[PDB]
C-alpha cells in the first residue's frame, strides 16, 4: 500500500520475509543429529552393485 499521509506499507511491515522450504513435513536426523539425505533407489534392471 501507500497510506493517506503518504508513508509506505511494504511487506516487511506485514509479512515476515524469511527463506525456508517448500514443505515442513520431512524432518530427518542421523545419529540423533539434524541431517538430510536422498533415498537412492534402483532403476529396474540396472545392477545394484554397479
Amino acid at each position: 500500500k501507500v497510506n493517506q499521509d503518504g508513508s509506505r506499507v511494504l511487506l516487511r511491515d506485514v509479512a515476515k520475509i524469511e527463506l525456508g522450504g517448500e514443505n515442513y513435513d520431512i524432518i530427518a536426523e542421523f545419529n540423533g543429529q539434524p541431517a538430510s539425505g536422498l533415498g537412492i533407489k534402483l532403476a529396474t534392471g540396472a545392477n545394484a552393485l554397479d
Binding site: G20, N23, Y24, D25
Partner: protein, 50 residues
C-alpha cells in the same frame, strides 16, 4: 451470468491442515479443513444465487 455462477457456486476449493506445515511449539491437533465442495444434485443446482 448463468455460466459464471455454476462456476463459483459449484467448484472445489483449497484450505490448509492445522499443524502440518511448520507449526507452533507444543501443538496438538492437526486436522484437515474442508472448504467449498461441488454440488451433487439437481436440488442444490436449482438453488443458485443468479
Amino acid at each position: 451470468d448463468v455460466i459464471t455462477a455454476i462456476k463459483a457456486q459449484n467448484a472445489q476449493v483449497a484450505a490448509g491442515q492445522l499443524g502440518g506445515t511448520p507449526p507452533v511449539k507444543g501443538q496438538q491437533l492437526n486436522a484437515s479443513i474442508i472448504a467449498q465442495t461441488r454440488l451433487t444434485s439437481t436440488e442444490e443446482f436449482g438453488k443458485i444465487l443468479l
